[PDB]
């Protein structure tokens, strides 16, 4: 006798043809018509916000099967949607003792998408793991999308705060990035990329509220070292590392205040915890009336506003908490007055704390390393109790050709970097807005003016005094959350060894 | 020879503003014993307080007119202009001042101290109907070079009269930084920013998150023949033509509702009025409950909202009116309820009007050309009195491989194009959300599944029912305003013959 096993297989694979006559099965979306009319379908986010009309009668809810635990005549399903999860209970004493229904439910693979008809109620002791403290008691359950393939790893493992406690399964970065579409379902990763969207929104709205316009400038360039080359119709072209030339040309056109949110591309063969070959740059360029520090304080206000808005309200607080659950770090700290140090002051601080050793002969040409900048971050965290500060007045020889120098001390420039947790997030400067000084500085840097003619020519019919800055988006998010690797805040990271997915 | 003393007046450099009233001045020297500097936009908005005393205003010299003891400067900022008057009688009869002011090149940036008064008959050109009587005027940035063309010529509406004023597209784009100072071009790009803002805020208010996905690909997202190639550290890469694959992977990851505003790159060798090799795509992808038409109506409401917000009073109507002054065109029109045609109906309309000759069994095989789209637009404008409409139910064989076909009538698909002034602006569809059907369709289109495996694998652990769409930003703006060429709505256009600026 083997027809018993084939009948069981029929049960596991059961396709429901009428959801009015049946209580379980795989269903086509077209067949989901209850009493020839539309179903009022809820998602778990609506349920969470309403509860933490849904309690009067049976409701319909869709979600992904996060977990199923079979326990004889009971089965417990965790449904998941975004950051929200809810326990649903199948108890076949309440389902006409249909053993086939239980068998079919127990066989459902994790991550399958189901529509459940059931009644909500609040248990005595609610499940700690679900942030919805109600449970659905299942009357019907239909699967509209069945998981077709064994998962590359378990979400229970991918969600775990990483530990050495015996029996811990780590999912390593390579496996996660290789199966990114599964990795992104962890609660922390979903929350990270909502926070990324939030930073974009806050940035744009702050600038728009201050009378900026958004611009979009080309990434295919006729001229750029550390740039990807392309064949552009038998011309040789390059990918933009920055929209720097075009945003200045817009200021020279009278646009006054511009920003861009757009990809940039870097071809350095660098494999580190923080370098990406492709990332999103937030770029600002704007005029000033008489002092470029007018703009510096503006950019400072911008970041303080970003910090304030990320740390405020229910939604952002929950997103940050959810990240922290898997990746704990102390909350980001900033002051009402942002500390500003000159480069010379920062050097002298590092020498005073015994982190740096230079002759006075060498202090002019010294180019601060990235580790040294982290040491400054530690010093300033200890003395000023902040994770955010500003360095100004870098030596001119260490900054790009378009940086305006001080006319009293030409060796010193009107430049600035902002730091979060000891790492640079923003770089910018007052720009040379005199076409003749600009030509002089381009020759001073041994650059080819013929490859910059269009840019140079935008200064030849007057130029407003202006300044600007460029910001790494993924890096700001990484440093705000204290995450250990830039690949955690870029959706599909690009690095010299990763072109896929 | 007393001409040297006269040239010393023309090239005069002021050295103390307090004790003087004119001259070129470096920005540091601008210390009036601080200065309250106004721009013409602030003045326009306050007047249409500043009138109790003298004020300072900065601007570009758009026009300069001199005779006898009177001098007229039209000062410009963005789309605002104001007439300033130099009368020697109120300036101790200085003639050196008159000579120096009258020698200033057009486009020079000046700081003026003056008194604002409302004249009896204000100038027709200036939209600020107040005049500034010049108590002092200094020049902080002097035009260094003759302009490639006159802004008076570039601003004028084009007549086809022989010998008429006409600034060529070629010249404009080669000198984009001057071209962008015309009132209409400034207004065009403020309006492009407005579209981005309205689009993002509509989606955000509807619970979307913004995503950023890579433009460097290991494999061509679309057909490889129209993709730019690049060397990515010994690998063969391509520039993205669309973020299609990645936004679907995000939906497959549970993001539920996503949009991206980002560049795309396409390598077709076409030189037309509407094709660009690089442009900005507005991309949307989202789930639905039971019927993909839920999403279509949502996309429709999004566009109606954009039109509503563009067409309202205030800032936008001024921007649009300034564009229409040089490039006239009937207001964009749309109905309270958007007309929806099936593809078969649209074709039969074209047949009924004699534009097409097709037997019944040939209609689904016919691929509507861009010219035929415009003819259909004229028919629909005459019959439905609108510039905006929707076509659904395109034939499956004429749509991309990820388009879900109608199961009952497979030659037909659940797909849609939106149209503005008869031209396609939005394209999208219900997506195949079953990994096995997806593989079947990939084989049906003779595509290489190994080149899509990451994308394909994102469907193997369940897939929500979802749809999406792609929208060209520059093209929406062009069709809204009725402009004749896509190069008018891209800041630094890229086409097969233009890589510079």
Residue numbers in the entry:
A (entry chain A): 98 to 149, 179 to 350, 355 to 631
B (entry chain B): 100 to 132, 135 to 149, 179 to 631
Q: What does the article say, verbatim?
A:
We solved the structure of apo PvAspRS and refined it to 2.1 Å resolution. In apo PvAspRS, residues SEGG of the Chain A flipping loop are not resolved. In Chain B, the flipping loop can be built. The SEGG loop interacts with a conserved residue Q371, as well as S350, N356 and A357. B-factor analysis suggests the SEGG loop is more mobile than neighboring regions of the protein. By contrast, in the equivalent region of apo PvAspRS (L347-Q371), the flipping loop and flanking β-hairpin are both well-defined in Chain B, while in apo Chain A, only the flipping loop itself is not resolved. By contrast, in apo PvAspRS, the equivalent region (R396-H405) is ordered. Interestingly, only minor shifts are observed after binding of ligands suggesting that the apo PvAspRS chain B flipping loop is poised to adopt a closed position.
Protein translation relies on aminoacyl-tRNA synthetases (aaRSs) to charge tRNAs with their cognate amino acids. Plasmodium AspRS is a Class IIb aaRS that exhibits unusual sequence features compared with human AspRS, including initiation from an internal methionine, and an insert in the anticodon-binding domain. PvAspRS (96–631) was successfully crystallized as the apo protein, in complex with the natural intermediate, and with synthetic Asp-AMS and Asp-DACM, allowing insights into the binding determinants. As anticipated, PvAspRS adopts a dimeric structure with features typical of Type II aaRSs.
